[PDB]
Amino acid sequence: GRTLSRWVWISLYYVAFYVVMSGIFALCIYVLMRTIDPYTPDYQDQLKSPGVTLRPDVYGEKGLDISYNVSDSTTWAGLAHTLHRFLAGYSPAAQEGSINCTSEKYFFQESFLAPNHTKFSCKFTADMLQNCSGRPDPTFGFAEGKPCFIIKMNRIVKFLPGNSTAPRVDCAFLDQPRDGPPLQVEYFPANGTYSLHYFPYYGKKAQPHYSNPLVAAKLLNVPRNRDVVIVCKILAEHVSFDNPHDPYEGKVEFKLKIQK
Amino acid sequence: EMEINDHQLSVAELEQKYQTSATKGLSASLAAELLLRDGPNALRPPRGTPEYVKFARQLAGGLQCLMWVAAAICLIAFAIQASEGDLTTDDNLYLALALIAVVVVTGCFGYYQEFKSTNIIASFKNLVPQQATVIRDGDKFQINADQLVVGDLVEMKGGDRVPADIRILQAQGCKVDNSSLTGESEPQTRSPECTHESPLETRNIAFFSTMCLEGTAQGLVVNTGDRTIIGRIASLASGVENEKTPIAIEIEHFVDIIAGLAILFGATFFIVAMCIGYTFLRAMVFFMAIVVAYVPEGLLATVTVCLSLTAKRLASKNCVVKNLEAVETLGSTSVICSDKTGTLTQNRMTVSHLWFDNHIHSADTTEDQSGQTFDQSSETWRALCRVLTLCNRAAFKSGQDAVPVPKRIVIGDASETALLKFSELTLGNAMGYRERFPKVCEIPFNSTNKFQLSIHTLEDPRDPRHVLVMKGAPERVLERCSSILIKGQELPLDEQWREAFQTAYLSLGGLGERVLGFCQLYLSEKDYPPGYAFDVEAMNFPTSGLCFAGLVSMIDPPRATVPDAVLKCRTAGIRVIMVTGDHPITAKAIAASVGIISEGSETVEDIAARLRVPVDQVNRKDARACVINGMQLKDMDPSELVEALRTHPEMVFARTSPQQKLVIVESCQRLGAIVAVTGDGVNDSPALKKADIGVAMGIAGSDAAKNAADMILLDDNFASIVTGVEQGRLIFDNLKKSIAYTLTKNIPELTPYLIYITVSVPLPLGCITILFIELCTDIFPSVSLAYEKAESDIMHLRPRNPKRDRLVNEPLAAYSYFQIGAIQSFAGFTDYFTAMAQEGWFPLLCVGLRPQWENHHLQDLQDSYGQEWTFGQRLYQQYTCYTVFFISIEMCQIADVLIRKTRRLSAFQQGFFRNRILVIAIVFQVCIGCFLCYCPGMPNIFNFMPIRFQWWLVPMPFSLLIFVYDEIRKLGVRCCPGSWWDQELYY
Ligand SMILES: COCCO[C@@H]1c2ccn3c(C)c(C)nc3c2N[C@H](c2ccccc2)[C@H]1O
Ligand SMILES: *[C@@H]1O[C@H](CO)[C@@H](O)[C@H](O)[C@H]1NC(C)=O
Ligand SMILES: *[C@@H]1O[C@H](CO)[C@@H](O)[C@H](O)[C@H]1NC(C)=O
Ligand SMILES: *[C@@H]1O[C@H](CO)[C@@H](O)[C@H](O)[C@H]1NC(C)=O
Ligand SMILES: [Mg+2]
Ligand SMILES: [Rb+]
Ligand SMILES: [Rb+]
């Protein structure tokens, strides 16, 4: 096409042009990454309500479906192992960088008091569940036919879910009212509450050694050999638990079939 | 078939061949039998026009072929993906479905845009069946011309249309108009004797579409329908296959460029996909992704409406085109080949000059009476105007007072009709004027007497005497003239005048003009009292010693506006050539009267007659003009043709066959020129179709010429071709303005995808979102560039070279794609990362984060601030970076449309707001841009959500940067034509 001497001079122009534009980009991102505050999000326009997760997080298609056979240890060995390797950070040996929280209300830190200008973070260890901690039962109730399902919310910077009382999880079926009683669960801690001194979250940089509060739902009433669907709603004022475009907005639903 | 020997037979042989009678005609039974055998005496129309298949063609083309291929790739990508496990997203289906949708909607658009063009020309056609006076079983009756069968006995009169191909048996001075078959504007004489062997030239054959001008004749039909001389020409014309228009050629050029780029990017980005650890199936999917991205979803629609507007501009001037592609051809055209009789000339015998008071006065030969008339003041003029008004038997038809005099239909001979329209213009109410002087005697034109004469009683009784008027051949009326009117007296016709009269006679004869002599004499009221019984057999009135009145000359003159339109095209750099079948001398006469041959240019035959040298010695290169008659062209060779074709630039072809017109166009197209031909008759229809564009007269045009044409001049205003090129030249420049606009946007939508592949960041842009840009938000601004006024004096530039000057080229595409789309890509990324960081995601976090982003199982993914987002919540963040990349395009596009307003001049020079329509298109680019964002519910109907007002302003600096950058580029090139800047930075 072009002459072999202008081929390079034409080439330098494109290179000289690209480097100019790419340089302006680098000048814009660096200003951009200096425009923001390291400890707080700027807008967070889609986190109007928090999301809820679940363990063991096992899906088929269409979301979480969990079916296991109590007599066969291989159908639930990997369920507890995910629970065990999940809680490896919920042990005192790994949760040292956090403090003995007993305030029982919002933990409003106005100043940063910790090594390297860090902040104080609460503690939540596995023993908070008393039957779903892995001791005495490392099967987390699966072998008994009463499996524990730990429930925990997403962390949002400076979000407050209410002054009135502790937000409590409330698990139950999608009503199958007449044939069979409603689901009976024992939650740990009792009443299925999250302590209010775990709020608000201030950021992974503000609290490098923070961890979420948890509650477990030891399912006791579920019949065996039946496909059942359980929904675990969070009940508080500043939480919406039903958004059609996000089925994990303040709620978790999952399929469970315990077979013997 | 049968005519080659028809005219050379004795009548006894013909009434055997056709089992008829030369004096009594066919039997009614046999004439009915022959009709079934040979079919109606009419012309087969194009009999292959199903209504549903004309739709099918509209779906083909350079863009359509690319559009179909891109659509097909989407499905075989969707199937390849659906097998590999993607969950119920149909952007493959939306994209491919919408891809064919424009190809259909544009196809319907064009189908109607030609169905109306073909229907309005049909509104202009005379639709009454022509009649034919036939003789069968010795009964002369009239029937429709279509019912004639081979061998019939027919008859003709003045004003009769010739019903079929007829062999002459008897003809009393019948002359006919062969202007449709030949270029001959001089009325041809028909005689029952074999003039020639070739039936085209012999006088004993009347042709199918021709017009009998005067006289009367009888003869047998030799061939009917498609078998006539006319039918074979149309059969030839149909056999001609027309070339593809240059505009379609140019678009087929850049689709070859788009695919050349598309497969390069796809392949080179596919071979890196495997190198980052992608599945052979999936990586091939991305390659298919890239090629689908490279096709402009809205380009085909934008182009057709750019051409739809200029067809509106031409149809506004009674210049109707059949297909939108031809709307642009004239601006590109480099050579025009124009039929003479009917196209250049009016094909209407008109009075051109007169001799009286020893002076030749030039009459106004225009049809709108826009030229110059002559000195209408002399006493001799009033006498001469009287004799031509009175000694004339022609008559206007009933109720024609509104239509202009030149276009009026007159019952009369060829010359009598012209002399009538003359007097009706100069005097007004000529036939009412001449009825004030009653007739008492007459002798029509006769061979033995050689003249026509009539004696009239005067207007008022105060003059009881009589007036004798005569007209005829100038030399045969002078022998009977004893005196001549000059300057208010009547002088004896001494030897001074006879030598001065014949010089004028031979002066106007050299022009190829028909000239008639006029004379008069006042009969004494004492020798000839009121009521005198004039006897014609024994001529008891003076047939001699008349007083010569004057000379009136007539010719087939040019049309009014053509003599200047030809000048305006040759100033535009277009090589104009005449191709006609009329005799050379009449051809070169008009060739000079209109401007084909310049003032002071001579053929080689004119140098030998000036230097008094034999033509052999005359140097060839010294001749600007040259005429090649048909006989002299056959013995030539295509290498000879090109030699003389571009040795004498002012070229003329005379006595050419319809094929000899076709070969010339081919020899011109084979030399690289794109040729336009203008014509009216069937002898042009073959050459009309092969031409890159064919202009046909809306009124004078024959059906074959009209049907085989690409453009129709409804009012026959030849001066609508000059405006045809500027609108063609404008759109060519206005397209590569508008085309480059919608091509630049392609890079910014692709680049986020191919970094989302290489870098694995969250999907910056949506597939449906690029559709609202390609098909909704940027079509309206894109078409506004068709309203850009000429940057240069577009009518003075040479016709574009078909090879170098192109709609798009490497300097154009490479600049638009890889320099402005590059700047646009950075506006997207800049506005992408801010929407990420300002919402929680740092730049260096997004790198390689995509696999977690699209994972339906990760419902607590940690952002750079540690916060945990559910899949739907971060999906909205993806929908957000969709619409911030989307708006980042638009703000740069409002600066892209303005910078495409001009290609060379600065926007400050012509002004920002020249285009009222461009700004009213830009306002609606942002109005629905603000609607798709802030409309409630669209977050889920589409992938658009209301962004806050901070991110609107982020890409605005880029839009001003592209304003200045090309401003500098355009401003730099215009001020200084750099020997590096003009060739590269100019598109
Ligand atoms: C949208 O969510 C699902 C992913 O959609 C894919 C997709 C997404 C974004 N894109 C952008 C910004 C461009 C320029 N292209 C694409 C594109 N193209 C994919 C394709 C499909 C069919 C043929 C070729 C490519 C398509 O599946
Ligand atoms: C933290 O404080 C609680 C309340 O007094 C107590 O039960 C627990 O043992 C304390 N833990 C440590 C490590 O001191
Ligand atoms: C919880 O643990 C206590 C102590 O071992 C036991 O008494 C109680 O039954 C357990 N609860 C359930 C629901 O098993
Ligand atoms: C559970 O496992 C045991 C042993 O593998 C088997 O016998 C039993 O049928 C299983 N239950 C069901 C419902 O299949
Ligand atoms: Mg003609
Ligand atoms: Rb595209
Ligand atoms: Rb054509």
Short mmCIF file of C-alpha atoms in Angstrom, two decimals, chain B residues 130 152 193 244 249 252 308 386 396 530 622 655 763 800 830-831:
data_model
loop_
_atom_site.label_atom_id
_atom_site.label_comp_id
_atom_site.label_asym_id
_atom_site.label_seq_id
_atom_site.Cartn_x
_atom_site.Cartn_y
_atom_site.Cartn_z
CA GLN B 130 -54.76 3.07 -32.36
CA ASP B 152 -53.92 -7.45 -44.97
CA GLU B 193 -40.88 1.15 -56.28
CA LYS B 244 -24.79 -2.61 -12.19
CA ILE B 249 -20.39 -0.88 -7.20
CA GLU B 252 -19.81 -3.54 -2.82
CA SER B 308 -34.98 8.60 -1.16
CA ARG B 386 -50.91 37.48 -45.22
CA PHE B 396 -56.12 23.30 -35.52
CA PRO B 530 -67.27 40.34 -57.78
CA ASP B 622 -5.34 19.25 -35.76
CA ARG B 655 -26.53 7.34 -39.85
CA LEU B 763 -19.22 -6.75 30.56
CA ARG B 800 -14.62 11.69 -10.23
CA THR B 830 -13.08 6.35 31.40
CA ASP B 831 -16.83 6.44 32.07
#
